[PDB]
Amino acid sequence: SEVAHRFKDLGEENFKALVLIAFAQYLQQCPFEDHVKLVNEVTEFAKTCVADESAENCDKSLHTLFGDKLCTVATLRETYGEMADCCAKQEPERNECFLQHKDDNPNLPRLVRPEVDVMCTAFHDNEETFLKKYLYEIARRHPYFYAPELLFFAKRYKAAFTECCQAADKAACLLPKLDELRDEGKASSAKQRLKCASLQKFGERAFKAWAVARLSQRFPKAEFAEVSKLVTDLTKVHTECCHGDLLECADDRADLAKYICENQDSISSKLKECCEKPLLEKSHCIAEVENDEMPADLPSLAADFVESKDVCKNYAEAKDVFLGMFLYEYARRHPDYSVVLLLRLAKTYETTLEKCCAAADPHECYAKVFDEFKPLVEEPQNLIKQNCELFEQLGEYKFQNALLVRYTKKVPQVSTPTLVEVSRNLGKVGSKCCKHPEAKRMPCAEDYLSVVLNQLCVLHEKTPVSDRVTKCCTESLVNRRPCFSALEVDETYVPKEFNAETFTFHADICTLSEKERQIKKQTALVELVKHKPKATKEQLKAVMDDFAAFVEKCCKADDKETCFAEEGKKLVAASQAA
């Protein structure tokens, strides 16, 4: 049995939680209740297999079991139409059908949160079900959320109420910690969506490379033989978690932290503090540990990678291992480089060795490779330095508006909502990284951009409208950023026509939080640039100044919310004029 296997390892709590997330991440539309039912029927079954390891079907594969369970409600096409199909499938891929049907943007209503007095009550009256509902809401809205990490966010989430509900002002103690978590969760989710996109769209050789560079940076003193061990394992973990096999992912993840902590002295010296705490906290600690100090006397790369005469020969022997060693050796001494840059250099190196090695005199050919590294390395440095300048002057809001205009011009076909959430996240890099010394600026900024760009990529893949996005997204994982920076303005885009439904206005805007206003302001700017790409320089600005006046005003006018209606058509007349 396997279900018995995992049960013994994770235990009732975690096992029950993971299976909930798995069910939550598969049938995102399906109501909380039903999931709980299946989760229980599923947990009960497990309990018998522990005793009798051959009872009903305790001899199967999680999937057959899991799949059939869900298939007791999926066949209801009136609720989940395209799902019934997956159920009529077989063993080899009745699972693939499911994975292939995950939604990155579910049509799930916004998740507002009741007053502090209710959450506290509901939390106190019944716990488990309060925390159960949490995981359900997150796992269903982030189908790729790193499962093992969601449990850590959960234990955290519980301690928030566990403490603040006992305060002198729960609203004051909670709200903050709740906000801090909502953010950190969206980040962790993005960080992982990229990881599954790599494995799934580009292959584990691709993911393997990323891991080598990243780990080699974090653990400079580690050895190539050791790092590879870690990379092999780490890959398997995420491969499982990304294929929907949460239980084994969680198990294997735990086994990895166990190992890393045991061979602490062999890997990093900053692991100590992570190895002294509860597993869930131990895992989240290791994955976010700062890099170790750089080994003292290190030879120059040129030695064995460009000056040696055996380069080409070694490359022929074990190219993958050789290139692997290069990346590890270049990353360990360059924590100031973004992971994608390091991968760009590595690809540049491989490409060179390929053409050079089949030459009349390789050496001579590949002798000046580092000369090309220069441009590759400077491009981002200059990009960062420049964009950090602009950001410092205009602040976050104005900076975001800048990227908004810019990016809408690059790919005007993309839906306004995506353009807005993406532009917003791109500008957040300023606050996040710009306050960093140049030594830590690039890894910070560029890698963060890879995550953000991977959204537009996955969100666009749903309904492809711009081949330029498709090209930049699918061409090369490591060159996505440079590809987009290169884009200018689509000379083939045919401007829009002002609609009525193109953008509605009803007063309901004077009640929304401040943030949700800037957003409605930005969503306007995007719509604008789409109707008038060219004729655009500064008027755009003077106009944004105007809309601000509109809101500030009518939100303080006492007529029925009729102004917004009469004056709504009034501003439209003015706009078209410009």
Describe, in plain words, how this protein is organized in 3D.
- The chain folds into six domains: 1-103, Serum Albumin, Chain A, Domain 1; 104-193, Orthogonal Bundle (Serum Albumin, Chain A, Domain 1); 201-292, Serum Albumin, Chain A, Domain 1 (Orthogonal Bundle); 293-378, Serum Albumin, Chain A, Domain 1; 379-490, Serum Albumin, Chain A, Domain 1 (Orthogonal Bundle), CATH 1.10.246; 491-568, Serum Albumin, Chain A, Domain 1, CATH 1.10.246.
- 71% of the residues lie in helices and 0% in strands.
- The protein has helices at residues 3-26, 32-51, 62-70, 77-80, 83-87, 94-99, 116-125, 128-139, 147-164, 170-202, 204-218, 224-243, 246-262, 264-267, 272-275, 279-286, 301-307, 311-317, 319-332, 339-357, 362-366, 370-410, 416-433, 438-462, 467-475, 480-486, 515-531, 539-554, 563-577.
- It starts with a helix and ends with a helix.
- It is classed as carrier protein.
- Keywords: carrier protein, albumin.
- The assembly is monomeric.
- The entry is titled "Crystal structure of human serum albumin".
